[PDB]
Amino acid sequence: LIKLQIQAGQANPAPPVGPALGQHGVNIMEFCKAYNAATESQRGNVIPVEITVYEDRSFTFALKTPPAAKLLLKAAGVQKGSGEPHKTKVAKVTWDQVREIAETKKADLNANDIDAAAKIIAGTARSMGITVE
Amino acid sequence: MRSERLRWLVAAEGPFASVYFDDSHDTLDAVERREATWRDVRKHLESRDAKQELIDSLEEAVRDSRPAVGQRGRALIATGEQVLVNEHLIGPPPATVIRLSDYPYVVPLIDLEMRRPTYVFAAVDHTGADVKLYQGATISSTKIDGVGYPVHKPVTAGWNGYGDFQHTTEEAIRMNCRAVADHLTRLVDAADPEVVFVSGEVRSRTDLLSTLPQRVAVRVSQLHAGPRKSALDEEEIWDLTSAEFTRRRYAEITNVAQQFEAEIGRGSGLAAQGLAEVCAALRDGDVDTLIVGELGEATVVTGKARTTVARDADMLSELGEPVDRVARADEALPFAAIAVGAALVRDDNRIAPLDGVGALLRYA
Amino acid sequence: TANIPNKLTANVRTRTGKGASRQARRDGKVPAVLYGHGTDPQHLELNARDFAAVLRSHGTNAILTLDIEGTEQLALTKALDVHPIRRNIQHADLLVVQRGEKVTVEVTVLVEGDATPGTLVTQDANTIEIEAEALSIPEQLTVSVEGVEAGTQITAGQISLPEGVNLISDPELLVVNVVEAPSAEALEEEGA
Amino acid sequence: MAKADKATAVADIAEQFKASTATVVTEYRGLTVANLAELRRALGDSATYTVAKNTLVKRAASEAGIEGLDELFAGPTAIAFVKGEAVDAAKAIKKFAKDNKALVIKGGYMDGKALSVADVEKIADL
Amino acid sequence: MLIPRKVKHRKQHHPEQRGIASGGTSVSFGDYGIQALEHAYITNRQIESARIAINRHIKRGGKVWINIFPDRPLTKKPAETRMGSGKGSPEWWVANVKPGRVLFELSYPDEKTARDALTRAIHKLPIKARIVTREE
Amino acid sequence: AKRGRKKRDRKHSKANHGKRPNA
Amino acid sequence: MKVNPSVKPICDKCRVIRRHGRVMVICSDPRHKQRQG
RNA sequence: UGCUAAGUGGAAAAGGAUGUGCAGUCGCGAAGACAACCAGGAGGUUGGCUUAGAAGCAGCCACCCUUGAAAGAGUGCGUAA
Fold this sequence. Notes:
Oligomer: part of a larger assembly
Helix content of chain E: 10-25%
Shape of chain F: elongated
Strand content of chain F: under 5%
Distance between the termini of chain E: 34 Å
Structural class of chain E: alpha+beta
Largest sheet of chain E: 4 strands, antiparallel
Number of helices of chain F: 1
Radius of gyration of chain E: 17 Å
Structural class of chain F: mainly alpha
Strand order of the largest sheet of chain E: 3-7-1-8
Strand content of chain E: 25-35%
């Protein structure tokens, strides 16, 4: 069972996918057409997926929410995080816009309540120099 | 050639003017050729509808250079808002080359380049020595002096041979040799030269070579020059070392040939030839060394990005992205090779690669 | 602060000098002097193992209760003579005190906490002078450095003291000087 | 663990049994954290699946009338506090244990008397 | 390398190497220090090698103090000459060290790196030494 | 330097008491 | 084998033992095998 | 009355080192300490930057939160990654 992060708007590119599952016996042509069709709802956000394989060299995959680090970048408008966090802070984020990432990530978080789940996203914030009001 | 000096050339964007020509202000019927070539390139740029900024950025680069001695070529590469590449060449190109396109043309620079690595030139006699270190633009000079003054053994010894200047002169010469060896070892440890030319005589050049450690004694080329009182000029030193540097640069091509042949024979997958999979490997970023053959008029169709390239749009459509432009192979492939920080090697008609291109990879 | 004094046994020195103090230290005792306001010097001897035991758990300014030939006396540790190499206790000056008497005592300060990550905490003054009654000397005064950033000075005037404790040292001593963390280009420029 | 921390832990565990109507003892040797987190959500609605030391819990058992349950605290130890109802746990444990096969019940408790493994699952059949 | 800006008398007798240190035997600026255990002359070429070994092991953070300065000069006379006819010119600067004297100091947030950084500097001095702290 | 070392080392006998002539 | 006056446990799997009046370091990795001499 | 296993006694340095004897401090421990065997060692997440590549494990900065019995922005080996 492998993991990979593929942006929604790309199907059958050379770098990310080809060598990735090119050694597990999984057909590459049939997966990309299926993945692209399923992922055509976002079309602008990279969303990961896990290839749950069977011994028969078939693929079955369930899609995931776009990563928390990428999601929090557009909420602030800055294209990249702080090279030296806690000294240079790229932008500002209030407690309001954090909750939407909690809801979008609710299916991929082990937390129980929106209050506890909000602190998980706040942890990623200071790791990349983003202030939480 | 490395991919460091041309790395910032990738960052620059805009139209690129690349001129390779002959700059030999030797004789009186040779200065005229300079402005003849200047007029030729001006009219070519006029015919290709170049922006004025290129021309008014080029005239001063052409006209403000102190003329190089003998027969030397000249290489220029500019964007219009600034100059980027401006050097002399070992030998003038057979044909004046002018190009105006978005991709710079750097193939003639791969071999023809008045730029050799750092090296040391030492003149030694068993009374001292003097050392010059070359790291490109800067030259450093040092004079090693001796502590044993009477390095000459007179015929006289004394009354019936009592007293003798055999050992007390050998020790002085050994002191001088030890001092020179220590200084040269310090220079080798600091600057890491590739060649240490030593010019002296049969006696005080083979005993200093026996004093140096194995670190430096492996990279020593022995010269045959004259006395230290005469002193040497830059032209003489250049002519002395050119013969060795020729063989040294030939050996690298030989070693690359051996690596390519071995990797092709094993069929492991660390070697690629022909555009078909060379372009794929270059796109994948795992190209370690690029060998440029006689590509000539072969064309490549690069997609949306300035880097991604493919042999034809028929197999580029497998990426989904559509074709954006068409460029010449010997003009776009080296660009992507520099982009992934690969080494560039100019074939000497001894590799015979398929389709006039080759690549040593980094993995499967 | 309420302190319970520590009971010790002291024996009057028969002899004095350097030839009799070396014998005392080779045996396991330490010479001592019990002077004070009573205008009454006394040359005593304390067990080396026992005397060092209370100092290990009660600071240098311990409150002793010496038993000199059956009586009980209240004493204070004034000064200690420690060998630079062997780390012994070559002597001990003891001062007689009474309850409710104000004594000028130099106590130690410990800095605790974790300041801004890009900061370096330096302590200048190791100790400060403190006036308190004989049974209420604090064995340690602590200062907290937390959230302190860049150039900041925790001067001796900001150190909190227990009630009933005065301050003899003026509020101008610099105790803790927190500054920016030195870079790698600053370690090379120092000391050359 | 520190001596004081062991004393602190018993105080919380002792009250957890007093406020709970019943309890179920199991073993978890072989359940991945993902497998366990599955049980903390299936049973998390009404039950709590906590574990602790054997002897440390043995002290807490002295505050209540479960003195006969000391046999089941040896080996890997799991205790489930059922604050609400008994049927909710009596059937959710059965299906989860059957799926994983690495979760074997040791016994139970109700009305001051333990109930064996065979008779603790039949409560769900009431 | 440390050299005094000026000294009154440039050729002096050899420093005495007797007794233990009368002062400067405790850590005053940093948190850790190096205490000497025997007499020697510590040249300025070994002080500079000792404080670079400390800097490289701690990389970025911390501060280094040097409590001994090379004031006193030693003179070496020209090589391969007989005895007499004057006195040699000064050649290197030393610092009279006696047992108990604290040479170097360091204040670093943790203990392992700070303690191992001082051990690297001890292996560059011609004496025996030990690591000491501010506690009693 | 074995001869010189041995000759000086024998000043540490019990009958010499740490001294000998010519060191 | 390495023969130096000073022997130390290069890695975390090295052990220091004493055979026949000699200090030795024995490790699974043959490079770290060394003895005192 | 004890010590030495080296023929030390009957030569020598920086330094290396589970040789052994004596005395003194501090931690952990029947609430089970150390060694050993059995099972977990997770989720956000491939933390942010740099990099062709950098995913705990060239390099720089930070070093959070959650489920929890515990799980480090990761102690090593390993892969181009």
